[PDB]
Write an enzyme that holds these catalytic residues in place. Structure first.
Site, PDB file in Angstrom:
ATOM      1  N   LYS B 270       1.149  -1.250   0.079  1.00 49.38           N
ATOM      2  CA  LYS B 270      -0.021   0.062  -0.152  1.00 49.38           C
ATOM      3  C   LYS B 270       0.981   1.259   0.072  1.00 49.38           C
ATOM      4  CE  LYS B 270      -3.005   2.742   2.846  1.00 49.38           C
ATOM      5  NZ  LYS B 270      -3.976   2.716   4.073  1.00 49.38           N
ATOM      6  N   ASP B 275      -2.278  10.316   3.655  1.00 49.43           N
ATOM      7  CA  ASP B 275      -3.648   9.989   3.624  1.00 49.43           C
ATOM      8  C   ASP B 275      -4.348  10.957   4.702  1.00 49.43           C
ATOM      9  OD1 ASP B 275      -6.040   8.760   4.092  1.00 49.43           O
ATOM     10  OD2 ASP B 275      -5.225   7.048   5.038  1.00 49.43           O
ATOM     11  N   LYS B 282      -9.419  13.219   8.592  1.00 47.08           N
ATOM     12  CA  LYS B 282      -8.756  12.924   9.701  1.00 47.08           C
ATOM     13  C   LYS B 282      -8.884  14.189  10.782  1.00 47.08           C
ATOM     14  CE  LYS B 282      -5.751   9.270   7.812  1.00 47.08           C
ATOM     15  NZ  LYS B 282      -6.157   8.096   8.770  1.00 47.08           N
ATOM     16  N   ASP B 293       1.780   6.302   5.739  1.00 46.71           N
ATOM     17  CA  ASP B 293       0.460   5.303   5.111  1.00 46.71           C
ATOM     18  C   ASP B 293       1.138   4.460   3.763  1.00 46.71           C
ATOM     19  OD1 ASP B 293      -1.936   4.214   5.544  1.00 46.71           O
ATOM     20  OD2 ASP B 293      -2.835   5.594   4.350  1.00 46.71           O
ATOM     21  N   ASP B 352     -11.738   7.354   4.192  1.00 46.41           N
ATOM     22  CA  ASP B 352     -10.226   7.225   5.006  1.00 46.41           C
ATOM     23  C   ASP B 352      -9.876   5.418   5.199  1.00 46.41           C
ATOM     24  OD1 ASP B 352      -8.093   7.362   6.574  1.00 46.41           O
ATOM     25  OD2 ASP B 352      -9.078   7.815   8.018  1.00 46.41           O
ATOM     26  N   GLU B 354      -9.591   4.105   2.381  1.00 38.77           N
ATOM     27  CA  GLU B 354      -9.061   3.814   1.082  1.00 38.77           C
ATOM     28  C   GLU B 354      -7.992   3.014   0.711  1.00 38.77           C
ATOM     29  OE1 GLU B 354      -7.622   5.760   3.324  1.00 38.77           O
ATOM     30  OE2 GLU B 354      -5.500   5.228   2.743  1.00 38.77           O
ATOM     31  N   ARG B 356      -7.558  -0.050   1.245  1.00 35.82           N
ATOM     32  CA  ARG B 356      -8.238  -1.328   0.766  1.00 35.82           C
ATOM     33  C   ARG B 356      -8.775  -1.203  -0.590  1.00 35.82           C
ATOM     34  NH1 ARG B 356     -12.263  -1.861   5.604  1.00 35.82           N
ATOM     35  NH2 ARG B 356     -10.543  -0.979   6.387  1.00 35.82           N
TER      36      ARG B 356
HETATM   37 ZN   LIG Z   1      -7.197   6.007   5.370  1.00 35.47          ZN
HETATM   38 ZN   LIG Z   2      -4.641   4.828   4.541  1.00 33.79          ZN
END
Ligand SMILES: [Zn+2]
Ligand SMILES: [Zn+2]
Ligand SMILES: [Cl-]
Ligand SMILES: [Cl-]
Ligand SMILES: [Zn+2]
Ligand SMILES: [Zn+2]
Ligand SMILES: [Zn+2]
Ligand SMILES: [Zn+2]
Lengths: 503, 503, 503
Positions: B270, B275, B282, B293, B352, B354, B356
């Site tokens: 990933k 993010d 967030k 991230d 958030d 995201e 996946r």
């Molecule tokens: Zn996220």
């Molecule tokens: Zn993330």
């Protein structure tokens, strides 16, 4: 450990360890290259090999040094000569004490007190070395069950002074440094103790013991809830109404001056042994730190222990305003209107602003002492932490000379304070449609309006307010009480007593 | 620095410094007695005098030792003999390196790799020492203008092994430890870089340079936004749609095996270079840490580097799924229904979640390589941090053998993972009245339902999922990327390539 | 309205209305009884019936008073004689103007300027009266479509001075008062304008019109984004990157002194026309008040307008740092590391701490003018509002004399500032493992750490920082800009130009 001062050369010492300094880059210090020339360049040889560049935190321990009477020579990295401020000086002493204790040295002779510290004389350097050495040895393990006690072979340290001229200031520094370090430790101990053990009764009990230990000059009185009610201290009573612990106000009287015209300096410490916020309950996060909400009383007690030990020729009265703020079926609540001892009424808007409700009644109560000046010490507002952070104490006052004196003491002692203004526009924020005043002024100027609140109870004498909400303790891994502002107050009292720390 | 292995006795070394251990209480290491008995009990004497109790953390540096051919003898406290676990062992080596760097030692010979360490053979103790020593030298100063470069006089360290029968396992431990330590550093460097510089294009650029540096076995292709659209990767496109940064999927192909039936192992990292959470924004507190991230892609890149250096006879493909989640006028929204590359539709309930949505398309994309095993690595859920903390990586899989290989590797490499279950009851939490599935299953079981989600896209091959949300980085004063799970994946690859355990 | 001064008696005035005072309890002002004796106790008689107790805020309008050359006689409650502070004095004047405007009085003569006001001479009393009167007439209806323009028959007020010896100080007071009031009014209009209209281009446009209206001594330059890029002002650029509004730094040069050695005083105002907080987004509650995040630029503009009108013989350069902080696909993010124009790198932990990122590049930029002193003015921290509330401006500086001149000006002008400390312990809170520094230092000491951050860019010159986050505007029913600290800065400029104080 014990401390003393002498004035001699390194090469003539016969100690388990002599400590001398080295500056960047691998620049042996004057005193140290006196010793190098005894061992024939042995030390400077090792420095050419890169064994100690002189950076702060760096050290070099030498054994069996050629023609050196002492069994060990401990060199410490001191940065850059004059370019040494008090802060780095304190670190150099801290490092020294810690390093020595990983060694077998039972005593040592230290030449670091001769370092050039910007603006600080011999007295200050020796006093700060003692205070820092003692701070370094602190530990709070009385509630742990594992622990096999720490390793401390270092039992005595002799600080060297330049000439016999400095022996006098040197000895004063040791006497003063030990009494203040003891006051600081006492305050840290009371602060670190859990609300579980250190409650108002525990404080009263420590106050009585202090009097018993110095019965010729100290007398302790302890006022309970029934007497408080007879005295009309309803605001103080309201705060602890909810808690099963009894509110107890401990008065420690020190009489060091006998003239009939002597006036006492009164110190009032907020002693909330725990503050949950009350009905206006605090959030969960870090609430255990509210055991420190009595650090003001802690400091006042430390100061009294200091005054008694030094037997200062002045009169000091320390009040430990013990109380506990808990929610419950008998807790006072938002909306209540309290009739203070002074007679003025206060509308409670938030029960977590209870320290000032305890202090106002004590401030009215202490006028029976006809004080020279009253100084309150309290972990009062989170606003002060936001304003001055964790490094400097907030100071407010109704008398400029007294504020000037406290700020000078804060600077001399290295336990800084900064003045915040009071003023009518801030008083107005305390207006209430229901009582003479409300107990809070809103977020804007929170630390100032709290001081303004207090000032309505102190018009009969010169007074100052120290908000130690940010300086009384640290959080994090090293969570612990600091003992502040014992040193500021001890310096203040030392100045009042006539001591010239400038000589 | 450099590392090598030899097999000799301390007394016979001619090094700037020889390192030996001492156990509590002040008991010289046997490997050392030959050395003490050469200086005439010079060490044992200093020891009964209290210079080194032996507690972990303590050290004792000695120069001009009577008749020693090495100029400095560094003794390190190791605690009690066969009561040394790998965690304490690593601290000991970490201490050794830091202490050596405070001296002028240009090289050294260390006998600590001979210490008895529970469950670890010669190969592991040497490899662990190499990886730990390199961990200690890590610094990220490329974006600072002050700095004058740390002090590293120690350019080489020789680890000693009991006999010549352990020299080859020692040299292999060094070869492996260096390659892995370098992958870990590459991953830490990428993770620590700001979103400002380290965006998808930067990762792609690093991916191209890697291929150039090993053009014989490595090929890199970068799939940009126009191609993703043509591939039907709409879910991946929707996550980065709000950001001005172009979404880029870097595919690093490492071919170390020419056999027509050597199926590749695919690693999918990933790569959210930042993010913000997107429309489901967030909170502010610590959002700077969201530059981590992309630590999954950082780890994958590190492994690809590791595998190129070791030239393992296997096929591995590493995907850096670069992307950026920003809120804005073109950002995807809560409520949107995306048509994933697999054809299955997904209702977005929270933007958030995201990672996946970036991964589901990449997991469908990689079925074209007919992978033998596929492993995704992702800082995926706060839920995993709550479940396994910062010490152990969360693992999920649709194939038990593969999950067992990974756990074993995590144990062997000291970069632990722990398997969490999947299951129909968790799958039901992903039910949507509008699409094939929603992208979140509520707070209960958040790390598991995320795995359930990913598993609906990995049905055609053996797959495992590593949620490194808590292991990829640490916060606080020591804020920084950890480089995990590079060591775990490297051990897994080493094992697939035939590594015997060197036992 | 217009103002003028004269020295005459009440009885000889031939005005539509003469305004005199009445002290509590119903005690006719000395200047009054003169006037009473013409109408023969006609006034004191009414005060006996109790028509004016003389409390602040009370008034009495008398028509056709027997034998008085003036048609209306307006009596005003002034509280108690000498115990009148400037604060209550301004209220009495404000009341007077409001009351007069409910009558037909087209002009009036006011003897209130003769009242005794603690520590304030004739010059200050006339100037406070003028500024307060203009302050009372403020309205902001330019964007309302209803209304029918206020009722202000009173087009002139004449203030009386004790003797002809005070006439000149009176005239000078009116001149300064008018110019400062105009400056204050311009600052309030700019502050009050919505972000919708008052963006960085608008501020630039206003700076250009100012130059045009005083083309002899004033020149305006506008630096845009392409230029900032070329100048290396990446910190400032990053803050505005997210917004469609171009960032624009307007530079207003005023040359009032032709000598080669008259170094300029440079004023820098944070001009964030709107501040949403950015990716570290602000809460909804009262976010409309963020249109006031350009009040620093507002004040600098008003001060420049004032120095232009008065034609002071000094050189002043006012910088309006316009920018807008918006969230979006192109906004800068937490984690980014910026290279400031000074070259120092800054890690962004919170995007709402953007004002200092705009200011650091401007503070570096202004060193090209070789300023004698640089003063930034910014609505910078919520911490300041918490520390000093809404009444006093927070001041920090790197040069004590500059700080003392500013505190003195703030007192003299009745637009107060209070100094806060800077310091190493506060600087340390800005430490970053990734850059030369972080842009925030945590909640403890937020206002101070912001000061410490700015000071790292002002080492080449004498500098001061004014945090007007709390003094620049008020909320609630009377929501509106205040125009502070225009008066503080004007007084600073007047003293630098040689102002007397007027004995
Ligand atoms: Zn996220
Ligand atoms: Zn993330
Ligand atoms: Cl109860
Ligand atoms: Cl946008
Ligand atoms: Zn409280
Ligand atoms: Zn409290
Ligand atoms: Zn902001
Ligand atoms: Zn702002």
């Amino acid at each position: 450990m014990e401390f003393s001062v002498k004035s001699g050369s390194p090469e003539k010492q016969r100690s388990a360890c002599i400590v001398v300094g080295v500056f960047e880059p691998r620049r042996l210090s004057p005193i140290a290259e006196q010793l190098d020339k005894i061992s024939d360049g042995y030390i400077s040889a090792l420095l050419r090999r890169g064994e100690l560049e002189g950076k702060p935190g760096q050290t070099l321990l030498l054994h069996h040094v050629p023609n050196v009477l002492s069994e060990r020579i401990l060199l410490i990295g001191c940065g850059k000569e004059r370019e040494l401020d008090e802060r780095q000086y304190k670190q150099v002493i801290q490092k020294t004490i810690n390093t020595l204790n990983d060694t077998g040295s039972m005593e040592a002779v230290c030449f670091l007190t001769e370092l050039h510290v910007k603006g600080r004389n011999n007295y200050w350097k020796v006093r700060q070395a003692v205070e820092t050495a003692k701070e370094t040895l602190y530990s709070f393990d009385q509630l742990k069950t594992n622990k096999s006690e720490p390793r401390r072979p270092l039992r005595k340290m002799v600080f060297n002074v330049p000439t016999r001229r400095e022996l006098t200031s040197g000895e004063r520094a040791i006497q003063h440094g030990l009494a203040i370090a003891a006051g600081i430790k006492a305050a840290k101990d009371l602060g670190n103790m859990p609300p579980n053990i250190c409650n108002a009764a525990y404080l009263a009990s420590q106050a009585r013991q202090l009097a018993d230990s110095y019965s010729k000059n100290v007398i302790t009185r302890v006022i309970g809830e029934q007497q408080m009610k007879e005295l009309g201290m309803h605001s103080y009573l309201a705060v602890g109404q909810g808690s099963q612990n009894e509110s107890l106000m401990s008065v420690i009287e020190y009489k060091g001056n006998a003239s009939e015209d002597a006036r006492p300096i009164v110190l009032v410490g907020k002693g909330l042994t725990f503050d949950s916020g009350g009905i206006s309950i605090k959030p969960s996060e870090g609430m255990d730190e509210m055991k420190y909400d009595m650090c003001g009383a802690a400091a006042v007690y430390g100061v009294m222990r200091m005054v008694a030990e030094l037997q200062l020729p002045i009169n000091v009265i320390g009040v430990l305003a013990g109380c506990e703020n808990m929610p419950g079926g008998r807790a006072y609540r938002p909306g209540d209107v309290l009739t203070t001892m002074s007679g003025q009424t206060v509308e409670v808007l938030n029960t977590d602003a209870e320290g000032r409700l305890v202090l106002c009644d004590v401030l009215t109560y202490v006028e029976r002492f006809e004080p020279e000046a009253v100084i309150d010490v309290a972990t009062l507002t989170g606003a002060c932490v936001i304003a001055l952070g964790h490094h400097i104490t907030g100071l407010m006052a109704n008398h400029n000379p007294l504020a000037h004196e406290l700020i000078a003491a804060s600077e001399q002692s290295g336990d800084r304070a900064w003045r915040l203004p009071l003023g009518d526009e801030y008083q107005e924020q305390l207006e209430s449609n229901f009582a003479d005043m409300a107990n809070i002024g809103g977020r804007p100027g929170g630390a100032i309006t709290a001081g303004c609140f207090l000032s309505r109870f102190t018009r009969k004498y010169n007074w100052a307010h120290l908000d130690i909400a940010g300086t009384a303790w640290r959080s994090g891994k090293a969570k612990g009480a600091t003992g502040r502002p014992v040193a500021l107050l001890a310096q203040f009292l030392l100045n009042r007593a006539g001591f010239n720390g400038e000589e």
